[PDB]
Structure 1
Amino acid sequence: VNSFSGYLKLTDNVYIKNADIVEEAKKVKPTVVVNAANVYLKHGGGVAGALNKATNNAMQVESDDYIATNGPLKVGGSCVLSGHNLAKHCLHVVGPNVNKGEDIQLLKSAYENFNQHEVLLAPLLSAGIFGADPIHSLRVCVDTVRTNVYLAVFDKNLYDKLVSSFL
């Protein structure tokens, strides 16, 4: 049993809810929240801008030190940093950005990072400001992630379309 409430069960391991990921993290304080990161960990907008704002910019300060030491992530890659006031850990995952011309085949590699964690609160990778089709992102998630993933989809309209169209 875990603390996640109000989710629709899609599969053995994948759950979904119309919820802003920021407010969900603050309520649950999950072990792992996933950020929709870019390779520079520049948390300007979308999910990343919203979680960084909720940490009062502490996520960005930690991220800048990480990049100064290690250099940029890979598209499809990840790193584990603090969850600050939102979670124990934040898993920063880089899905391909269609609005930068990145290979959508990298979306499966991105979701494979989730398998290193038993339970996660996450957004749909490459959705929102990253330009991919969220229906596709949900299909790759279900077909790639084997650990228990709780998805927070804020756009009520999109949530209803994801559920209605789910095979």
Structure 2
Amino acid sequence: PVNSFSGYLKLTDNVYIKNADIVEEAKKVKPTVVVNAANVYLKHGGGVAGALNKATNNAMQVESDDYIATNGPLKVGGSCVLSGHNLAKHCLHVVGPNVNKGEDIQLLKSAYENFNQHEVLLAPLLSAGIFGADPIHSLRVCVDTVRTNVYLAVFDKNLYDKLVSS
């Protein structure tokens, strides 16, 4: 693990952000930890999870299915560390709340608290895809909760611009 992050804008002492594809960042940066925004069953069917899984050539899904079949689902707000395959040493799969389905958005705090067990992480915003949390709000919880060094990758330029102006 090299953690050679570059080109990030510093938002706070420990939160940095970049308009970039998290998969391409992981390949460039060789992070110790890449974060996946997962569901409780680690079914990586779309969004960031699907992109990370595809970049591992489906190995992440094979490993995740085996973990879940033995251990049962994660809790919302919870996480688990699995292999990072070719993307990172470790993948921290974190489950933000599915806000659109009625899960408590306060669980974003719990979800980001999992980042505090790692010195440095490459990560997406949590719950900011199909789970329906306002990305501005998700960033705010991240800033207010995470105390270790988080390098956030935001794919869409318009969203990045909105986040950086907020």
Q: TM-score range, shorter-chain basis?
A: over 0.9
User: C-alpha offsets along residues 97-120 of structure 1, whole Å, 9 cap, x if unaligned?
Assistant: 112211000000000000000000
1:130 aligns to what SS in structure 2? coil
Q: CA deviation at 1:129?
A: 1.6
2:4, 2:30 within 8 Å by CA — same for their partners in 1? no
Moved more, 147-156 or 98-107: 98-107
Q: Residues 86, 68 of structure 1: CA spacing in aligned structure 2 closer, same or farther, 3 A cutoff?
A: same
C-alpha distance in 2, partners of 1:41/1:80? 12
Relative to the length of structure 2, the TM-score reads: 0.97
User: C-alpha offsets along residues 34-57 of structure 1, whole Å, 9 cap, x if unaligned?
Assistant: 000000000000000000011110
C-alpha distance in 2, partners of 1:37/1:72? 11
In structure 2, the residue matched to 1:83 is 84
Could you list the runs of 5+ residues in structure 2 that have no partner in the other structure?
A: none
C-alpha distance in 2, partners of 1:142/1:17? 15
In structure 2, the residue matched to 1:151 is 152
User: C-alpha offsets along residues 110-154 of structure 1, whole Å, 9 cap, x if unaligned?
Assistant: 000000000000000110221100000011000000000000000
1:128 aligns to what SS in structure 2? coil
After superposition, the CA RMSD in angstroms is 1.0
C-alpha distance in 1, partners of 2:131/2:27? 24
User: C-alpha offsets along residues 42-82 of structure 1, whole Å, 9 cap, x if unaligned?
Assistant: 00000000000111100000000100110000000000000
2:34, 2:123 within 8 Å by CA — same for their partners in 1? yes
C-alpha distance in 2, partners of 1:2/1:81? 18
1:129 aligns to what SS in structure 2? coil
C-alpha distance in 1, partners of 2:19/2:129? 14
Relative to the length of structure 1, the TM-score reads: 0.97
